[PDB]
Every structure is written in C-alpha cells, then in structure tokens.
PDB file of C-alpha atoms in Angstrom:
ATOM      1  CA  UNK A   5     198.558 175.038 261.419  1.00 51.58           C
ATOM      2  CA  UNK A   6     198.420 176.661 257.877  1.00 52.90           C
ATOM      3  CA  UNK A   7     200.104 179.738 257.389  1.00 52.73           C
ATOM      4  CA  UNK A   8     197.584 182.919 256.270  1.00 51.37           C
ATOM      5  CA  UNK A   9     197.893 185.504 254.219  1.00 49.01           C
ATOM      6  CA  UNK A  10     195.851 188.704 255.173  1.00 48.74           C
ATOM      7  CA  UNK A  11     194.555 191.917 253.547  1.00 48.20           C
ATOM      8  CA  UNK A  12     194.315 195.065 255.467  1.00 45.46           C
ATOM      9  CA  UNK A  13     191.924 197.576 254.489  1.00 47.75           C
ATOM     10  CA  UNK A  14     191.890 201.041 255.599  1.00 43.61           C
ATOM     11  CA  UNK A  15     188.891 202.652 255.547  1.00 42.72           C
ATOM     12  CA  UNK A  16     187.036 205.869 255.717  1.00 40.80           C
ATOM     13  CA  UNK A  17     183.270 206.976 255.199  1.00 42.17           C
ATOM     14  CA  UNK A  18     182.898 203.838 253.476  1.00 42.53           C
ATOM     15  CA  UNK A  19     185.923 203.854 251.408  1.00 42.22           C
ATOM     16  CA  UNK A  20     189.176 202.719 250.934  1.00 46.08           C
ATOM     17  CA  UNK A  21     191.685 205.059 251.795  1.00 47.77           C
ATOM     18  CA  UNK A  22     194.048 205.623 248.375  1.00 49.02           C
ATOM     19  CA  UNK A  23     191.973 203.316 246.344  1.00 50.79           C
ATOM     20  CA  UNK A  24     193.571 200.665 244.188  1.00 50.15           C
ATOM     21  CA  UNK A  25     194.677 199.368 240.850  1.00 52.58           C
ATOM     22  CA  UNK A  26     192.119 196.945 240.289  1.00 51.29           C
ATOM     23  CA  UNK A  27     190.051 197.809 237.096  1.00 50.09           C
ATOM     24  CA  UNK A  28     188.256 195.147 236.816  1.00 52.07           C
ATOM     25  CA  UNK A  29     185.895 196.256 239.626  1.00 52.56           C
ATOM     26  CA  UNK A  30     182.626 197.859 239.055  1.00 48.21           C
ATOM     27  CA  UNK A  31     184.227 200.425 241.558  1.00 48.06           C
ATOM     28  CA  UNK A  32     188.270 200.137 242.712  1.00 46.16           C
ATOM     29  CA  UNK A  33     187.793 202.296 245.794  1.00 48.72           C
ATOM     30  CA  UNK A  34     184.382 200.161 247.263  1.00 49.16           C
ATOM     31  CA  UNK A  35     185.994 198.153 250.452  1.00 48.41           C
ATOM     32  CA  UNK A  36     182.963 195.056 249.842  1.00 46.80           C
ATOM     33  CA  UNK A  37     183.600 194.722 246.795  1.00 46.73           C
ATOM     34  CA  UNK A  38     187.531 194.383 246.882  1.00 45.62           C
ATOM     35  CA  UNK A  39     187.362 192.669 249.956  1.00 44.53           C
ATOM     36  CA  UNK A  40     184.869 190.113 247.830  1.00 42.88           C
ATOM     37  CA  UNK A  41     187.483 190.206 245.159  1.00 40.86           C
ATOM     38  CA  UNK A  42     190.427 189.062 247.648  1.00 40.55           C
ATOM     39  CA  UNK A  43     188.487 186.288 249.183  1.00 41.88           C
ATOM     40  CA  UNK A  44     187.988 185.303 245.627  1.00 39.20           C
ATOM     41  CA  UNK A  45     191.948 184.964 244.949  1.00 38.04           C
ATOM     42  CA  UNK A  46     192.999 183.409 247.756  1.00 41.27           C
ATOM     43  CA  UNK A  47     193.334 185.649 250.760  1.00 40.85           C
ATOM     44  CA  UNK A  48     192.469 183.880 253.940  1.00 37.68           C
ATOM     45  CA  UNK A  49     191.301 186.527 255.983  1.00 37.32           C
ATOM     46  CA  UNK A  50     190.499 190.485 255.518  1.00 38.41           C
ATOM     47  CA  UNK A  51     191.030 193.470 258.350  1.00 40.11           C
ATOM     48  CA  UNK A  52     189.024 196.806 258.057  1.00 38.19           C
ATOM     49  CA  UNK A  53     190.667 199.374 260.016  1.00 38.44           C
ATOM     50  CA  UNK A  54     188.458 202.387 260.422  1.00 33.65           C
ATOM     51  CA  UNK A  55     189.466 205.911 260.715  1.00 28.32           C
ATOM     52  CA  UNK A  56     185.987 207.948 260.397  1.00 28.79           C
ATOM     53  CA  UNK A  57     185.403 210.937 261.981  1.00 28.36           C
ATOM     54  CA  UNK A  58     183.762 210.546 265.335  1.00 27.99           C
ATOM     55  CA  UNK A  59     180.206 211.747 264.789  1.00 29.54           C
ATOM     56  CA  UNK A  60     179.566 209.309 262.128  1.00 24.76           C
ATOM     57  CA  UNK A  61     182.168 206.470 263.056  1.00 26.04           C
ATOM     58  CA  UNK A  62     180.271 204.065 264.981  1.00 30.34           C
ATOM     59  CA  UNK A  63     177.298 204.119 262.293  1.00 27.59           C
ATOM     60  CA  UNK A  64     180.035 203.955 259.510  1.00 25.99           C
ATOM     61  CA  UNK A  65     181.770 201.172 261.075  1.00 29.28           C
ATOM     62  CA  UNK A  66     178.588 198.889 261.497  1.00 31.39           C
ATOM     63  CA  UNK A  67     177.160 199.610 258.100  1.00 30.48           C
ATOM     64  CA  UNK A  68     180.733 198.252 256.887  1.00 30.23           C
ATOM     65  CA  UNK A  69     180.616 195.580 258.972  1.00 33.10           C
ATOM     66  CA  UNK A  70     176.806 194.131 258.013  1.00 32.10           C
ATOM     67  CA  UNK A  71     177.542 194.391 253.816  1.00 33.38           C
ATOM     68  CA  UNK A  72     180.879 192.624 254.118  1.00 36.63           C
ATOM     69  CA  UNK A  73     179.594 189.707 256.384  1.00 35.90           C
ATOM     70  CA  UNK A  74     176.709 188.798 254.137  1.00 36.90           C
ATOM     71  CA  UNK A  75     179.234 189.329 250.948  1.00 33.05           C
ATOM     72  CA  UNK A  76     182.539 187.548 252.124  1.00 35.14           C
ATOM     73  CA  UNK A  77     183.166 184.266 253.442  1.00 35.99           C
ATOM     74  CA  UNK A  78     186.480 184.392 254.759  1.00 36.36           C
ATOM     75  CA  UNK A  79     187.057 185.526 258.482  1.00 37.41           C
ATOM     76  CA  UNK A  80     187.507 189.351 259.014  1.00 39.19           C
ATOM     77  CA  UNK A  81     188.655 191.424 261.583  1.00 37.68           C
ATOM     78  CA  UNK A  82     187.225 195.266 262.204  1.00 36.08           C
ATOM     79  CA  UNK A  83     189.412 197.817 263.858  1.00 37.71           C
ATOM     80  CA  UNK A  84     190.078 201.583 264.581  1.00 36.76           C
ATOM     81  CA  UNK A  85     189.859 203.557 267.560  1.00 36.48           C
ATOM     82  CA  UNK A  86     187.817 200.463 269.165  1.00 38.51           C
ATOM     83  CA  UNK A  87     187.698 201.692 273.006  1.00 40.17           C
ATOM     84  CA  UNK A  88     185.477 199.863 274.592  1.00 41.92           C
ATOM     85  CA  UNK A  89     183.316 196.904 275.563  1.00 42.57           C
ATOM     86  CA  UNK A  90     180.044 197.619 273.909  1.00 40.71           C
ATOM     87  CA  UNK A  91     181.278 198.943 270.620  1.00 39.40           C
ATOM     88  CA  UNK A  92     183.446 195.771 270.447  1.00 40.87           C
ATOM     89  CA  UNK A  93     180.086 194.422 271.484  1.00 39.24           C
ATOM     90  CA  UNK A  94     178.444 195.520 268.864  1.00 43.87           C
ATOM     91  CA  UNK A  95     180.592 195.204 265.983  1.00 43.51           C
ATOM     92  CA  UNK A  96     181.166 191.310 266.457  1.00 40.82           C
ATOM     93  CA  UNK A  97     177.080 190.603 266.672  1.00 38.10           C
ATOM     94  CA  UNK A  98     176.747 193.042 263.368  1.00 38.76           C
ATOM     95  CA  UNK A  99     178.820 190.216 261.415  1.00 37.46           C
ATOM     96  CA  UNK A 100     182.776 190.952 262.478  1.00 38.27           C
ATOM     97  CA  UNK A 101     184.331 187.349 263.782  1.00 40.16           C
ATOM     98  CA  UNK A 102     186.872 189.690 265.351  1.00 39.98           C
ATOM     99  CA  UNK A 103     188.010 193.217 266.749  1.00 40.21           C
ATOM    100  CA  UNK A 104     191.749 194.691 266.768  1.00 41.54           C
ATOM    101  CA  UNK A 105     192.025 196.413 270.100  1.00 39.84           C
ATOM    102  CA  UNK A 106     195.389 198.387 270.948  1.00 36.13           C
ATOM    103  CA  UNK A 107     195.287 201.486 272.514  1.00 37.02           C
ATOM    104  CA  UNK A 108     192.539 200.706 274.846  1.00 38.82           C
ATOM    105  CA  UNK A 109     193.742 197.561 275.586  1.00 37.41           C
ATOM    106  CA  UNK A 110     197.257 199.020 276.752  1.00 35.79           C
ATOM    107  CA  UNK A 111     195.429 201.312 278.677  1.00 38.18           C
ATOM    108  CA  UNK A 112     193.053 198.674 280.389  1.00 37.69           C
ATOM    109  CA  UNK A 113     194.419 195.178 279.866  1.00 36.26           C
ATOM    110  CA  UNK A 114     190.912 193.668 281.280  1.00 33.61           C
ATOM    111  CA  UNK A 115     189.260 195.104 277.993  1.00 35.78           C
ATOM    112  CA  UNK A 116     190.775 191.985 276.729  1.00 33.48           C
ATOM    113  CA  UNK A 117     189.188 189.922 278.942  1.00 31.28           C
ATOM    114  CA  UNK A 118     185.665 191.887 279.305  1.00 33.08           C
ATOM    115  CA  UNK A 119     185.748 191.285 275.571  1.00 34.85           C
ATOM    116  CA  UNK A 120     186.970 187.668 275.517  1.00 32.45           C
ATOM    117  CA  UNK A 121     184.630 186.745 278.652  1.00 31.28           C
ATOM    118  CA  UNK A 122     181.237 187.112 275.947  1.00 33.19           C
ATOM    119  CA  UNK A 123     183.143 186.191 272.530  1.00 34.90           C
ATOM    120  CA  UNK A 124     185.576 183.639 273.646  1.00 37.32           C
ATOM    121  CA  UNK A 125     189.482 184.327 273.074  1.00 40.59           C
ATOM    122  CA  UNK A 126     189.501 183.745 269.726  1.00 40.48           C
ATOM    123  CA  UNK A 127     187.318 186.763 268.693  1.00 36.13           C
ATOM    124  CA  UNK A 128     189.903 189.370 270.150  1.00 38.83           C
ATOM    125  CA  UNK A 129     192.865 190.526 268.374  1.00 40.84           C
ATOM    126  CA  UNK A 130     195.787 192.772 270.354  1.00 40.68           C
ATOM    127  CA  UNK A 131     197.078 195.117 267.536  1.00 40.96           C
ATOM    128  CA  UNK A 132     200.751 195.880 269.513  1.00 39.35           C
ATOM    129  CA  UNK A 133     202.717 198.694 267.480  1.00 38.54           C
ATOM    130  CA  UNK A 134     206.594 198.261 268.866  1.00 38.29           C
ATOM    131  CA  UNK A 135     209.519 199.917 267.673  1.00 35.65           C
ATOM    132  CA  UNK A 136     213.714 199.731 269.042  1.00 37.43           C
ATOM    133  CA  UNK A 137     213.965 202.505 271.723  1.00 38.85           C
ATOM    134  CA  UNK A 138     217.670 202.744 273.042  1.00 38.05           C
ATOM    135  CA  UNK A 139     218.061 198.907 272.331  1.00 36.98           C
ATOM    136  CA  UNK A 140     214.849 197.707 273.855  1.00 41.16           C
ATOM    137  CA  UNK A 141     211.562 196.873 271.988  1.00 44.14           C
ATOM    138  CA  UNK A 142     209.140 198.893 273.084  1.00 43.77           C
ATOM    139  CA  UNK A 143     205.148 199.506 272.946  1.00 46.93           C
ATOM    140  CA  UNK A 144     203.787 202.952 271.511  1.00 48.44           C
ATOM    141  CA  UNK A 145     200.071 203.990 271.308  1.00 50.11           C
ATOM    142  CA  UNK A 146     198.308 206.608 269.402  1.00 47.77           C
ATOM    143  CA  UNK A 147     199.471 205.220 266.352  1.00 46.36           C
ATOM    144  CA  UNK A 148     202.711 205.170 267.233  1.00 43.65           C
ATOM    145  CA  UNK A 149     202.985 208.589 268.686  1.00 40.77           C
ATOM    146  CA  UNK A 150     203.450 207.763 272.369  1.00 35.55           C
ATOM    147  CA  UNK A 151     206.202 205.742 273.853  1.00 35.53           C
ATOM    148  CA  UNK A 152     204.054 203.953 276.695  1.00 34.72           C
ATOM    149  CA  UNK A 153     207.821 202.685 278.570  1.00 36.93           C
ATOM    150  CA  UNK A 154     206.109 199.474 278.669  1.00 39.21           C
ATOM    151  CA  UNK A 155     208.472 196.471 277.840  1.00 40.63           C
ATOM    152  CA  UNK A 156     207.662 194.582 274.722  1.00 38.17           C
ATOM    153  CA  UNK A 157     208.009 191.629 276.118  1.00 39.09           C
ATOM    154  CA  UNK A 158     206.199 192.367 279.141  1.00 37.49           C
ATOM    155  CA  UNK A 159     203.152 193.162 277.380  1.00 39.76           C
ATOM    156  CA  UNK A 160     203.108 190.346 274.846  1.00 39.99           C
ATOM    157  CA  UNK A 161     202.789 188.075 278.157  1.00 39.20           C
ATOM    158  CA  UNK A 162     200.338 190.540 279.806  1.00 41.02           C
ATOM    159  CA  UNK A 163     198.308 190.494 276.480  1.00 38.94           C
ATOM    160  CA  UNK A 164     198.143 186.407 276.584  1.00 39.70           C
ATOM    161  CA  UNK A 165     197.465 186.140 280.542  1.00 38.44           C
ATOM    162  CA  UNK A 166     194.221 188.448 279.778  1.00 38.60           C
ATOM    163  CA  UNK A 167     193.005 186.581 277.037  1.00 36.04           C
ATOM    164  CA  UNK A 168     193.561 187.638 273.903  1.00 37.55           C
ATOM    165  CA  UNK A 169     193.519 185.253 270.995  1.00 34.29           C
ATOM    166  CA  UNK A 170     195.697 186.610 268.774  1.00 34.64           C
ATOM    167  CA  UNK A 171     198.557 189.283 268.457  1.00 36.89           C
ATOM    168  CA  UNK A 172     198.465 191.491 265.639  1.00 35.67           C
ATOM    169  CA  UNK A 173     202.339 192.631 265.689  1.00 36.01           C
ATOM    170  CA  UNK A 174     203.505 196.179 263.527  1.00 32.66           C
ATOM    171  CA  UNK A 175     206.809 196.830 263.786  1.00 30.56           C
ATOM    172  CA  UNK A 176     206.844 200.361 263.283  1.00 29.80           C
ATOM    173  CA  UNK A 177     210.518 200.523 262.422  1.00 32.80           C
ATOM    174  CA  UNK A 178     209.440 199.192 259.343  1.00 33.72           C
ATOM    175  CA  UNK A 179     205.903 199.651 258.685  1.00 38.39           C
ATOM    176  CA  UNK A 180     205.420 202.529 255.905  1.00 36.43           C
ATOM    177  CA  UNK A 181     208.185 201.153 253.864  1.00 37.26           C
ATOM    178  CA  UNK A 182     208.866 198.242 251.479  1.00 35.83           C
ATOM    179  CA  UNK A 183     212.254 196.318 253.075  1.00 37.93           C
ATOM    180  CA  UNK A 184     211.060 193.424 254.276  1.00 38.24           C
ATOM    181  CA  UNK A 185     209.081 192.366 258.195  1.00 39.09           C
ATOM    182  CA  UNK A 186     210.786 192.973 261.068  1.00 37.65           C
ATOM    183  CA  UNK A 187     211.832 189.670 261.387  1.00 35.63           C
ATOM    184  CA  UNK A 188     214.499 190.377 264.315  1.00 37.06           C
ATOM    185  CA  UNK A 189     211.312 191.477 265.987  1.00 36.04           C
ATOM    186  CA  UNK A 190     208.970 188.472 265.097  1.00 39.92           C
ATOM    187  CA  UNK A 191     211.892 185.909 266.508  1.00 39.87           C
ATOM    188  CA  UNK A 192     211.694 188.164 269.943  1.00 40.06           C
ATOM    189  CA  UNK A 193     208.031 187.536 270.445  1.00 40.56           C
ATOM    190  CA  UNK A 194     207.661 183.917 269.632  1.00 39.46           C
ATOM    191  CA  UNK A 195     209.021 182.186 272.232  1.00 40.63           C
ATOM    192  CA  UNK A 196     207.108 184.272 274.697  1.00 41.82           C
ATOM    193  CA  UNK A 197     203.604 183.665 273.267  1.00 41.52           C
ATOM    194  CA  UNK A 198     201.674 180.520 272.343  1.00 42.15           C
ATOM    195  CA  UNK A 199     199.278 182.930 270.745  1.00 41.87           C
ATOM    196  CA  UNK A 200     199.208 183.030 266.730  1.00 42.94           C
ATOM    197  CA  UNK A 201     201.199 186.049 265.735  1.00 38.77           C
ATOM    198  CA  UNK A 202     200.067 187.912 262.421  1.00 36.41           C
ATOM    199  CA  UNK A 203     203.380 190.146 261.257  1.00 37.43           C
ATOM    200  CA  UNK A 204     202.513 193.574 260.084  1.00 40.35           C
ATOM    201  CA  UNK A 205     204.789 196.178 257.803  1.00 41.09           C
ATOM    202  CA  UNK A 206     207.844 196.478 255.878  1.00 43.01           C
ATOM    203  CA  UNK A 207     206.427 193.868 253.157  1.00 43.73           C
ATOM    204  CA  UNK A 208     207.447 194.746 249.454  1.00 45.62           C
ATOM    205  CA  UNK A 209     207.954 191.472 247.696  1.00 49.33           C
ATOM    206  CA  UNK A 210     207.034 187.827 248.224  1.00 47.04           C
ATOM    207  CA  UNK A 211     210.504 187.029 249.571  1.00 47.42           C
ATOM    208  CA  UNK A 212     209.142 188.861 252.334  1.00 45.90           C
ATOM    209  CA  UNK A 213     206.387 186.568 253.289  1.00 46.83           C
ATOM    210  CA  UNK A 214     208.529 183.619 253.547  1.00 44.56           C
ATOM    211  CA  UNK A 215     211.104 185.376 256.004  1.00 44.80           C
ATOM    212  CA  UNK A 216     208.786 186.242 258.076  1.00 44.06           C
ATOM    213  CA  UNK A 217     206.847 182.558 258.223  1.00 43.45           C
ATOM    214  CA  UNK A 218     210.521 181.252 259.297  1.00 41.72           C
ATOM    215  CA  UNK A 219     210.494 184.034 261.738  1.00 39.72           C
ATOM    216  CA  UNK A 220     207.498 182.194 263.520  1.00 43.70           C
ATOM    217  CA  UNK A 221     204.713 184.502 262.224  1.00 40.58           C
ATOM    218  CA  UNK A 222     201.720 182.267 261.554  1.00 44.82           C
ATOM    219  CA  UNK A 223     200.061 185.015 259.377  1.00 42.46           C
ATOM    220  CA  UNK A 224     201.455 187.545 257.223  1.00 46.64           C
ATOM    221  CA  UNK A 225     199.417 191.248 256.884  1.00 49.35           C
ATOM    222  CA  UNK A 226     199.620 193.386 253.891  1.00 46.64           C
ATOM    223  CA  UNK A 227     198.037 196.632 252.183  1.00 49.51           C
ATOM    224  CA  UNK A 228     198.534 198.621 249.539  1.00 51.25           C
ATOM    225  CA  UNK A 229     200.857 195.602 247.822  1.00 49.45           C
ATOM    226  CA  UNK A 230     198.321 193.914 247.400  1.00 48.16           C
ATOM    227  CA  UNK A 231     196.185 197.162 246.752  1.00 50.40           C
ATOM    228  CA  UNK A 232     198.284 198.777 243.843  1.00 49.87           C
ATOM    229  CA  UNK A 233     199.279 194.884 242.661  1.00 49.12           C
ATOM    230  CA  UNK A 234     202.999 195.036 243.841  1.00 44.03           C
ATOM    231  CA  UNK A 235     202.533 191.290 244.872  1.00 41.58           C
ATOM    232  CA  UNK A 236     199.598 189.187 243.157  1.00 45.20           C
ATOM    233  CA  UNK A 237     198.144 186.696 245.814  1.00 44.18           C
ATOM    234  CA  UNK A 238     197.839 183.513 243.594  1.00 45.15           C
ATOM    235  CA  UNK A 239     201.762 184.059 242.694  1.00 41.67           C
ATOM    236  CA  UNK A 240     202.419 184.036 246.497  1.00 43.69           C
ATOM    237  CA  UNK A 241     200.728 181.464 247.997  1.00 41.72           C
ATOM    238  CA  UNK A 242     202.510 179.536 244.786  1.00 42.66           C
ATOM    239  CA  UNK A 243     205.495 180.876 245.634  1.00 41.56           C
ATOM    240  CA  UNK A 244     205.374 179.982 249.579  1.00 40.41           C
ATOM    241  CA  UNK A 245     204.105 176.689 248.611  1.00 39.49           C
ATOM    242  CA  UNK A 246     206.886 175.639 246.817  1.00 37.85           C
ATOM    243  CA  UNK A 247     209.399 176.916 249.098  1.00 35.13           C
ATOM    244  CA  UNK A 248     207.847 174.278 251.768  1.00 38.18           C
ATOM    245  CA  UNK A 249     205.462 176.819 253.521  1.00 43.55           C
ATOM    246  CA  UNK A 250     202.011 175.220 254.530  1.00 41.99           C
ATOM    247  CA  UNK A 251     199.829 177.512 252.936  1.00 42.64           C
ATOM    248  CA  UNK A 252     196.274 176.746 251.902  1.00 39.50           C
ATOM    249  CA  UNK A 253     195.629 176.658 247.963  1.00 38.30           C
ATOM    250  CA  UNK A 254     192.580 174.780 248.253  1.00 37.79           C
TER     251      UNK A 254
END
C-alpha cells in the first residue's frame, strides 16, 4: 500500500500544546483549524492526543472530536488516557475513525478486542512506547515511566492476536529529539506483525522519513516539525516520491 505521512497533535482544553508557526491562520494555536490546514497540504491522516485534566477531559475530548470530523476529511485518530470500552465507545460514534489505546491495553489486552468486536480491527490503534533495557526492547507505560518487563516482541504478537489494527510504535530512545526514527527498532517489529506499523519520534529532517519507510514502517508520525515548519509536507512527499517511495500526491 501507499506510504502515509501523519500529524500528531497534542492537545489540551481545546488547544494545541506549544502552538505553531503558521501565520497564516486566523488562529496558530486552534487544533481544527491546523488540522484543516494539514489535510489541505497533503497530510494523510491527523492524531489528537489529549491530555486535559480529568474533570473536564471526556467533554473536552468529544467537543474536539465532533468540530474536526465535520471540518477534515482525512482519517484521524483520538488518543490520551483512553481506558476503557465506552469512552472508546463514544469517541469513535462522535466522528473519530480511530482510538490510540496503550496503557489500558497493556494492562487488559481484551480492551483491544472489546473495542475491535463493535468497530472492527481497523478502528483500534495500539500506541506501544519501547525503549533498549539491558539489550532487550522493552514496553513502558505511563508515558514511559514504568518498565512493564514485558518483551517487545511478545507484546507486538499479543497486540495482533487480540485484534488490533494497527501499531502505533514510539521509540522512546529517540522520541523528544531530532536524530532520526529508531529504525533498528522498526526492522525488529516487522517481521513479527502483519499489522501496518506507523513509526513515532526522533524525526528532524526528511531524510528521516525515507529511513524509516525502508525500515518497514508503512506510516511515518510527526509533531512539532511539522508544527514550527522544520519539514514542509509538500517538500516531503516530493522528496519521498522521487526517491522511489509510494506516497500519495494526488
């Protein structure tokens, strides 16, 4: 299949988190309207990830969720402390075509499939967070503050036996920085999955995007490079093109 380039949006209270650079928008720091924007350039697909205080959360989440379906076309994926059935539930009939589950789901692997059983495979995304622990890859939760001792590679083929449709993959020895995907990381995971893989962190310049599509990701996630215009969009898909990567331009 095509490759896709994605656009991760953190969010809070309605809000991107940092803003961005873009000054043609009416407002830079309004998720809708920059996730509008993206579709507009050529990004294939958006993620919201959520992190709104509790009390309002699940009302924030859903008021996202309703403005961006009836403003975007693309598929997008909502996520952020997303612990159970009936928020997923919810979320999904509000307008999201998919949740990120990762915490919850390492905690109870039939989440996945209570959530797949309603909304097929394809709506549920497994965010996995893995970083090299005394040679091994291995799984952390809590955004990456604990070490669950679960295998890497035991839970990728856990995650696809449940159901999942997708595996959102962060490798948190380089997410935060700019020096390129884990693509040691990627190549682990491939064989062991039939599942698309969408790599996540480490991405600073378009180079980046094509060494991690010859990895074996089928979908490459990126934030505030895209946010702060590091990388423009129509330059990469250009750029990918031309190096032979099937990338929609369309």
């Amino acid at each position: 299949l095509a490759k896709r380039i994605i656009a991760c949006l953190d969010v809070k209270d309605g809000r991107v988190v940092k803003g961005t650079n873009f000054e043609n928008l009416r407002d830079s720091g309004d998720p809708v309207e920059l996730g509008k924007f993206y579709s507009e350039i050529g990004i294939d697909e958006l993620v919201f990830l959520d992190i709104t205080a509790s009390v309002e959360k699940r009302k924030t989440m859903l008021e996202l969720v309703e403005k961006v379906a009836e403003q975007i076309d693309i598929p997008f994926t909502v996520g952020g402390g997303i612990h159970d059935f009936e928020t997923a539930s919810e979320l999904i009939l509000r307008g999201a075509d998919k949740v990120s589950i990762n915490t919850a789901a390492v905690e109870n692997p039939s989440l996945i499939t209570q959530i797949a059983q309603t909304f097929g495979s394809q709506a549920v995304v497994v965010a996995i967070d893995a970083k090299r622990v005394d040679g091994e890859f291995m799984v952390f939760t809590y955004s990456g503050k604990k070490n669950t001792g679960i295998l890497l590679r035991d839970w990728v083929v856990e995650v696809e036996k449940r159901g999942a449709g997708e595996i959102l993959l962060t490798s948190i020895d380089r997410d935060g920085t700019k020096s390129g995907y884990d693509t040691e990381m990627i190549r682990f995971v491939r064989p062991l999955t039939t599942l698309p893989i969408i790599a996540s962190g480490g991405a600073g310049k378009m180079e980046h995007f094509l060494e991690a599509f010859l990895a074996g990701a089928d979908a490459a996630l990126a934030a505030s490079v895209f946010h702060f215009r590091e990388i423009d969009v129509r330059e990469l898909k250009e750029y990918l093109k031309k190096h032979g990567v099937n990338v929609r331009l369309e």
